[PDB]
From a paper:
To obtain further insights into the structure and dynamics of the [name] S at a higher resolution, we collected cryo-EM data from the same batch of viral particles. The particles were refined with a C3 symmetry followed by symmetry expansion to extract further information with regard to the local motions within individual protomers. The set of S trimer particles with all three protomers in the D0-down conformation was refined with C3 symmetry, resulting in a D0DDD map with a global resolution of 4.7 Å. 68% of the final S trimer particles corresponded to the D0DDD arrangement. The atomic models corresponding to the [name] S in the D0DDD and D0UDD arrangements were built. The D0-down state has the D0 tucked against the S2 subunit, while in the D0-up state, the lifted D0 adopts a propeller-like conformation. Despite the moderate resolutions of our cryo-EM maps, we observed well-defined secondary structure elements and bulky side chains, with clear protrusions from the asparagine side chains at 21 out of 23 putative N-glycosylation sites, which we attributed as the glycan structures. In contrast, the D0-down conformation exhibited a cluster of N-glycans on Asn726, Asn873, and Asn118, which made extensive contact with the D0 and S2 subunit. Despite the discrepancy between cryo-ET and cryo-EM in terms of the absolute proportions of the individual states, it is clear that the D0-down conformation is energetically more favorable than the D0-up conformation.
Numbering used by the authors:
A (entry chain C): 793 to 990
B (entry chain B): 645 to 842
C (entry chain B): 892 to 941
D (entry chain B): 991 to 1238
E (entry chain C): 1041 to 1139
F (entry chain B), G (entry chain C): 447 to 495
H (entry chain B): 31 to 347
The structure:
Amino acid sequence: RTEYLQLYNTPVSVDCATYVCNGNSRCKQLLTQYTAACKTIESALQLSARLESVEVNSMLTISEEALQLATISSFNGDGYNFTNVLGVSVYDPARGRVVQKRSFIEDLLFNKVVTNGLGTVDEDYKRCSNGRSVADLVCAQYYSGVMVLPGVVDAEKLHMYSASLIGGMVLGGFTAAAALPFSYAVQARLNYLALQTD
Amino acid sequence: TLDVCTKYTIYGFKGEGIITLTNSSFLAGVYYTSDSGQLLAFKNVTSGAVYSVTPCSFSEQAAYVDDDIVGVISSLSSSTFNSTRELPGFFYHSNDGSNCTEPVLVYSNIGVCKSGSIGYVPSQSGQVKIAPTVTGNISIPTNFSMSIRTEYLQLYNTPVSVDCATYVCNGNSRCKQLLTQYTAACKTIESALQLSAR
Amino acid sequence: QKRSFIEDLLFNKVVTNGLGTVDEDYKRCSNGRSVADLVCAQYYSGVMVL
Amino acid sequence: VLQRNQQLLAESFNSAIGNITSAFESVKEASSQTSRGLNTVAHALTKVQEVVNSQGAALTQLTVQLQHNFQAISSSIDDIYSRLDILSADVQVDRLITGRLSALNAFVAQTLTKYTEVQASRKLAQQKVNECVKSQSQRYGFCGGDGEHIFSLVQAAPQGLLFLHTVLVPSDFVDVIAIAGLCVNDEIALTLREPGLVLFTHELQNHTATEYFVSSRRMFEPRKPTVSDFVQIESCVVTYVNLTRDQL
Amino acid sequence: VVNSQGAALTQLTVQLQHNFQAISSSIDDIYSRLDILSADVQVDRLITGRLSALNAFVAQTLTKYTEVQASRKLAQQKVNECVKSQSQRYGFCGGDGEH
Amino acid sequence: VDALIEVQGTAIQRILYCDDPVSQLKCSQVAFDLDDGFYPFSSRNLLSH
Amino acid sequence: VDALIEVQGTAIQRILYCDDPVSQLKCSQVAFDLDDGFYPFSSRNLLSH
Amino acid sequence: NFRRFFSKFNVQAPAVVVLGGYLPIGENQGVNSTWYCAGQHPTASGVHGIFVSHIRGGHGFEIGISQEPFDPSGYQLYLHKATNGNTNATARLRICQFPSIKTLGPTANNDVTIGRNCLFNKAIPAHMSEHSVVGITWDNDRVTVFSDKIYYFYFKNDWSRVATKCYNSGGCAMQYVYEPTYYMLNVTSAGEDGISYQPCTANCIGYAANVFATEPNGHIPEGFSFNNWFLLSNDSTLVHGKVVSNQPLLVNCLLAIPKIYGLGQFFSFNQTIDGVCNGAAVQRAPEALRFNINDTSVILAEGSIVLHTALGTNFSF
Ligand SMILES: *[C@@H]1O[C@H](CO)[C@@H](O[C@@H]2O[C@H](CO)[C@@H](O[C@@H]3O[C@H](CO[C@H]4O[C@H](CO)[C@@H](O)[C@H](O)[C@@H]4O)[C@@H](O)[C@H](O[C@H]4O[C@H](CO)[C@@H](O)[C@H](O)[C@@H]4O)[C@@H]3O)[C@H](O)[C@H]2NC(C)=O)[C@H](O)[C@H]1NC(C)=O
Ligand SMILES: *[C@@H]1O[C@H](CO)[C@@H](O[C@@H]2O[C@H](CO)[C@@H](O[C@@H]3O[C@H](CO[C@H]4O[C@H](CO)[C@@H](O)[C@H](O)[C@@H]4O)[C@@H](O)[C@H](O[C@H]4O[C@H](CO)[C@@H](O)[C@H](O)[C@@H]4O)[C@@H]3O)[C@H](O)[C@H]2NC(C)=O)[C@H](O)[C@H]1NC(C)=O
Ligand SMILES: *[C@@H]1O[C@H](CO)[C@@H](O[C@@H]2O[C@H](CO)[C@@H](O[C@@H]3O[C@H](CO[C@H]4O[C@H](CO)[C@@H](O)[C@H](O)[C@@H]4O)[C@@H](O)[C@H](O[C@H]4O[C@H](CO)[C@@H](O)[C@H](O)[C@@H]4O)[C@@H]3O)[C@H](O)[C@H]2NC(C)=O)[C@H](O)[C@H]1NC(C)=O
Ligand SMILES: *[C@@H]1O[C@H](CO)[C@@H](O[C@@H]2O[C@H](CO)[C@@H](O[C@@H]3O[C@H](CO[C@H]4O[C@H](CO)[C@@H](O)[C@H](O)[C@@H]4O)[C@@H](O)[C@H](O[C@H]4O[C@H](CO)[C@@H](O)[C@H](O)[C@@H]4O)[C@@H]3O)[C@H](O)[C@H]2NC(C)=O)[C@H](O)[C@H]1NC(C)=O
Ligand SMILES: *[C@@H]1O[C@H](CO)[C@@H](O[C@@H]2O[C@H](CO)[C@@H](O[C@@H]3O[C@H](CO[C@H]4O[C@H](CO)[C@@H](O)[C@H](O)[C@@H]4O)[C@@H](O)[C@H](O[C@H]4O[C@H](CO)[C@@H](O)[C@H](O)[C@@H]4O)[C@@H]3O)[C@H](O)[C@H]2NC(C)=O)[C@H](O)[C@H]1NC(C)=O
Ligand SMILES: *[C@@H]1O[C@H](CO[C@@H]2O[C@@H](C)[C@@H](O)[C@@H](O)[C@@H]2O)[C@@H](O[C@@H]2O[C@H](CO)[C@@H](O[C@@H]3O[C@H](CO)[C@@H](O)[C@H](O)[C@@H]3O)[C@H](O)[C@H]2NC(C)=O)[C@H](O)[C@H]1NC(C)=O
Ligand SMILES: *[C@@H]1O[C@H](CO[C@@H]2O[C@@H](C)[C@@H](O)[C@@H](O)[C@@H]2O)[C@@H](O[C@@H]2O[C@H](CO)[C@@H](O[C@@H]3O[C@H](CO)[C@@H](O)[C@H](O)[C@@H]3O)[C@H](O)[C@H]2NC(C)=O)[C@H](O)[C@H]1NC(C)=O
Ligand SMILES: *[C@@H]1O[C@H](CO)[C@@H](O[C@@H]2O[C@H](CO)[C@@H](O[C@@H]3O[C@H](CO)[C@@H](O)[C@H](O)[C@@H]3O)[C@H](O)[C@H]2NC(C)=O)[C@H](O)[C@H]1NC(C)=O
Ligand SMILES: *[C@@H]1O[C@H](CO)[C@@H](O[C@@H]2O[C@H](CO)[C@@H](O[C@@H]3O[C@H](CO)[C@@H](O)[C@H](O)[C@@H]3O)[C@H](O)[C@H]2NC(C)=O)[C@H](O)[C@H]1NC(C)=O
Ligand SMILES: *[C@@H]1O[C@H](CO[C@@H]2O[C@@H](C)[C@@H](O)[C@@H](O)[C@@H]2O)[C@@H](O[C@@H]2O[C@H](CO)[C@@H](O)[C@H](O)[C@H]2NC(C)=O)[C@H](O)[C@H]1NC(C)=O
Ligand SMILES: *[C@@H]1O[C@H](CO)[C@@H](O)[C@H](O)[C@H]1NC(C)=O
Ligand SMILES: *[C@@H]1O[C@H](CO)[C@@H](O)[C@H](O)[C@H]1NC(C)=O
Ligand SMILES: *[C@@H]1O[C@H](CO)[C@@H](O)[C@H](O)[C@H]1NC(C)=O
Ligand SMILES: *[C@@H]1O[C@H](CO)[C@@H](O)[C@H](O)[C@H]1NC(C)=O
């Protein structure tokens, strides 16, 4: 069976002063009479952002043993594939260090639902101030004052978290010479639910 | 005048900004506008060259600690602080280019120290639980201790009541006689209020 | 029975004395001869805090 | 039952309650990123501190819109009624009352909207107090988190309750070999019955130490096995040791 | 849901172009063409309308934050109980069958 | 000039000017003391007229 | 006449008239292709003047 | 001695100011009675101000405050710093609720009303010298720190007893003052060299609460009661609260104790006023005029003022 759930939402910030006035002095002098609404909205915005960021960063739990065992070589499949699920190891980018990339199914689903160049990827705001180009929509609300905060969690963090989570079952004893076969775990679960003689 | 901040009056619209030349080709229209009412792009009809305008002002964020402005984050390479460090997507400005090992203000994977240095927050490592096994090697836990956790929950809220008749009229007779035409809203609001309270 | 240590600490930490948490005596609003506070303002307006 | 565990646990509990009570005061003096994590004192205090002002708010602004004038000469109905003819004054006060009633309609809509989530949260809270406190839950990490639940304390808090769950946490691990089962005469499989118990051998026969003990999968209590804890199977596997009647 | 979460931002720019019973939506245009008095009144109307609109927007924001809070609580519960261990409740994990 | 005024019993005390970005932020939140955190600021454009 | 126009770089392409109930539904959703489903329609009343 | 103490706070050269407070007078100048509280005409109200000049042990300096009424709801003051070095003399200063002991010394319980943590927690530099002393003074809501540059803190609390952790101190090393004194200060040197500190004779209270010090940037100096000042309001007044608005506060020049307007003094809204400024001066066109009225009868009897409009209309009062 399949199931899908959400945990976080994209936060946004804005400055009321620049949004309501485009740098004029007399207008902001007039605005100074009524400002408590601006304080209320911004207090709510940054407070809500900070609390959820703190709690979501506290939510994650990471194990290095699962990182070691998440590779294809470290996994001993026995009658089971676990290929489209397990990630692809030994990747050497310009950084020069081995990194983990997307596996089959998830890389399919990102390119299916998410079009390249959409708002899911982080947006470089330097080009907005660079100039000499026809401004896109993002620069429009950048000038307006709407700031789209960077994602609290990176997609790579989610992928490595998933790799760590899926490796918990194969985690046997500490400093295991070889990973325990999945069939043994299946037998263990079958025996746990009820005794068997076959 | 080009490439300077200036008060411009183009085609009946007056604004403030820096005007620049763009290498775009378009054979339709004389000016181009966005959904914000800003005439960013206009064409030199005699030559066909296109120009784009950007405001002389910007909105940026700052990190305030103790009693002074320490962190400045922006998209411009010029700042009061001596050190300007380019980071993926933006510019950071500070007076120290040293390491940041004990950040005070942390968000997502980015942390800023009191001294002004910036850095990447290391990923938090969570607890470990041993997966079920039926053979081989088991790490049986022992030598336990206490960990007291906190939790807070709400169960009730303060109720409030109001009389619409006295709120909308301060005891006048003709006003309430006029109000008698439309009263079902008052009945609805009070029926909701006392029922929910009870 | 009165408050113990931890809870008596937390009430006086988060709740300032004379705030809206404590029950409000509405008799003083009708008593008069004093500069009316904010509570009497919405009492006259019609807002009743149960 | 040698009572050193009891005193160690008690002194650890006293030290822990002492330092958590200390952490209630001036938490920011030496607070770390871990100290402000989930299910921590700092998170609870900041949550309650913000929510108390949040619930105490949203009433002051209700008075504000009364002063607002809705395309009328003045916001005082008595002022308007005694200075201008009845017709336009009636029209203007109709505009005033319509705007005011719409504003309070929005207000009352917000009210039961607030009532909904407190209904749901109070349902969850009564469930949790019914299940995590008066009895023992068998779900790992449900009470408190990432650990077995022993007991909890309940304290009154402004506009709610506070839970103080005591979680037992391990600190050391014992690594021993395990044995799957036994076959005598390689037809009678003597196998343990309850999965929660496990049979192990402390070390090996390297120095004649083939002693067998049985214990739970979380507690290290090496004890002699009992006949009633095992069952007989007609089928045997390679992994089972092929013992004899003399060594039984 | 991905388009639902990606939406509800574009319309925020729209009401800026809307004119609130004023000569024009550009405050700079109005300020330099008419006397300070009626221009100040009109810009007061503009700022009041704009602040009310963003008040509605921010009210919608934490309103959205509430249900994602609740759903994330449920999700962390489910990942704690249906994955790392074995649940004894029939149909709880997945449905109508043992997990 | 523009400044933050706090009144207690019709008594003038605790004056605070706003001719400074730090002062501008301080009197943008009508608080003498501000907690540590992140706040928005607008680029200066009054130098040249 | 009334029709749906799609512009890409100030180029006129993919014209589509609306003198048909199917065409009216098509240009009521500014989409060249419409997914299968249920949609509302208004009875014709322009035949008789 | 007194020169260093007066030079701790900066004052413009063309300025004369009268200071009133519990200034140091003598090493052992103390009360002749045992009263420590305050009432009608209070003089022996305990140590109103304490000053430290010397040590016998040298381990360090510590100060703390308390009160006989013993109200645990308010704050408490505790400071500690190390002597034998100017750099090491960084005083750690704390206006916090310290649990301490209900009595003197570790013999009793602590304060059970301390829910919140603290308000003031700072490190302030200090210097050690024979003629340089470090002091604290409390008076009603105001509390002032005589160390380096001046401090003004606003909080309503009560204190009547002073405690020092370092008991190894002589009688003359510590100096406690309990009676306010008035002194006229005149420093025509733009520096630490003060001309004189002659005590004031008459109109001392009025002079203290009316004379300013024109800062070079034009800002008003801190430490003023503003008794003769009110907010500029067209209608109504805020009973209590906070607000930001444009107000007439920036000053170009100040004239006090005047004599020349009895000769028909003329002011123009265009040209800068002429007179002996109270310190620094700024060459700017005036925007508004503020008048601090001492006696109404002087204006009523022979005071004659005429308002000259831009049109030329004359308005005689
Ligand atoms: C960077 O931008 C700033 C402002 O925008 C400019 O101004 C200062 O430049 C100095 C030069 O590096 C920096 O501050 C100095 O740091 C020195 C070393 O720092 C260590 O030691 C101090 C304690 O002394 C610690 O607080 C700190 O965390 C480090 O551990 C200090 O030795 C300096 O103190 C000296 O200051 C003056 C001038 O040199 C001397 O006369 C004193 O006697 C004293 O010895 C000083 O604190 C820092 O960059 C800026 N300071 C501040 C407060 O912002 C710089 O010009 C600009 N460029 C560079 C390269 O800094
Ligand atoms: C969790 O449990 C599983 C299930 O048993 C273990 O898997 C086997 O574990 C046993 C015991 O832990 C292993 O036996 C051990 O082999 C290790 C290999 O190191 C030496 O191996 C040869 C043997 O002579 C040497 O030549 C070589 O140089 C290595 O130094 C050693 O720890 C032991 O072998 C001998 O090591 C030294 C050096 O010779 C001697 O002095 C010792 O006395 C000892 O005789 C030991 O015998 C077995 O190899 C494991 N097999 C497999 C397939 O995993 C896991 O290892 C265990 N997890 C742990 C321990 O982290
Ligand atoms: C659960 O917790 C218990 C209690 O701490 C642990 O038992 C301890 O285990 C550690 C390591 O295994 C021991 O540390 C060292 O043990 C050596 C041998 O232990 C014997 O002797 C000690 C007395 O020294 C007895 O307490 C113990 O029961 C054994 O009989 C010692 O020789 C070592 O001595 C070193 O430290 C001492 C100071 O303690 C110095 O004076 C010595 O000179 C030398 O430097 C050392 O103590 C520890 O002793 C054990 N304590 C007890 C009370 O048994 C369990 O191991 C742990 N369970 C786990 C980890 O799975
Ligand atoms: C206690 O004692 C019992 C009894 O010996 C052990 O159980 C195993 O019993 C079997 C049967 O007597 C022993 O023989 C092994 O049989 C395995 C399966 O049977 C196959 O036999 C033939 C030949 O392989 C197949 O054609 C046929 O289809 C059956 O499927 C085989 O897998 C073993 O073959 C191994 O050796 C041959 C060479 O003889 C190689 O060619 C193979 O590739 C393979 O390596 C073997 O024939 C078996 O030896 C017994 N196990 C052990 C470990 O000895 C219990 O295991 C034992 N308990 C303990 C703890 O030692
Ligand atoms: C109580 O009620 C009274 C009404 O009696 C209000 O008084 C008004 O206050 C405002 C605010 O100062 C006055 O407005 C001012 O008008 C000046 C005169 O305008 C001339 O100059 C401008 C160019 O600046 C021309 O465009 C115009 O046509 C006129 O020729 C303005 O100059 C003022 O703006 C500038 O003033 C100075 C001048 O350098 C600058 O330093 C400022 O920064 C600013 O840019 C200003 O707009 C108005 O005239 C007053 N009316 C009357 C009748 O006196 C009170 O404000 C009100 N509230 C209180 C608390 O008293
Ligand atoms: C410090 O106190 C002295 C004394 O002034 C006395 O008190 C004042 C309140 C007035 O009542 C004075 O009349 C009275 O004497 C003052 O400083 C000194 O003031 C004298 C003025 O008598 C200055 O002499 C002047 O010298 C110039 C140049 O020769 C002449 O043109 C003047 O006519 C006058 O004679 C003297 O220079 C001045 N010296 C110093 C060091 O201040 C002053 O009143 C007061 N300081 C300040 C800043 O007010
Ligand atoms: C100060 O007053 C003068 C004159 O204006 C007078 O006062 C006004 C309040 C009105 O009531 C007027 O009706 C009345 O006549 C003004 O200053 C004059 O203009 C400039 C300003 O600095 C100065 O001289 C000028 O220099 C330029 C450059 O060379 C010439 O082009 C001008 O023709 C003029 O000479 C000088 O201050 C003064 N000049 C003269 C001849 O009076 C000003 O309006 C006012 N406010 C200020 C100076 O801030
Ligand atoms: C329970 O926790 C407390 C600390 O929270 C442990 O120590 C107790 O501390 C208080 C305050 O320090 C002691 O109060 C005493 O009051 C007398 C006056 O009546 C005063 O003279 C003392 O100096 C002290 O302030 C209290 O007596 C003390 N409790 C003791 C010594 O038993 C306490 O030990 C913890 N109890 C257990 C069983 O662990
Ligand atoms: C009302 O106020 C105006 C000023 O706002 C007065 O105007 C000024 O009046 C004085 C004397 O009345 C004039 O002084 C004269 O100057 C000439 C030289 O020009 C001199 O010969 C005379 O002896 C005298 O000193 C001054 O010039 C004049 N200023 C202006 C701008 O007109 C007016 O007098 C006042 N009304 C009354 C009734 O006094
Ligand atoms: C001290 O800093 C240098 C570089 O400065 C910064 O370092 C990090 C805090 C991060 O913010 C970088 O982007 C800054 O440039 C460190 O050198 C970097 O080290 C990281 C990993 O530690 C590596 O990914 C970068 O490629 C390195 N960059 C360069 C130019 O060498 C250095 O490691 C820091 N030292 C310590 C002890 O943390
Ligand atoms: C436009 O031409 C190229 C890209 O087409 C670019 O490198 C160049 O700088 C541009 N020239 C301008 C903007 O004048
Ligand atoms: C727990 O409290 C004791 C004192 O009772 C203290 O020594 C210890 O450091 C505290 N533990 C932690 C983790 O703070
Ligand atoms: C400074 O020096 C003094 C010398 O008496 C010493 O007592 C004190 O501890 C020192 N402080 C620091 C911070 O080095
Ligand atoms: C000021 O008034 C006095 C009244 O005593 C008078 O003698 C004097 O001449 C007046 N001054 C001027 C300049 O008119």
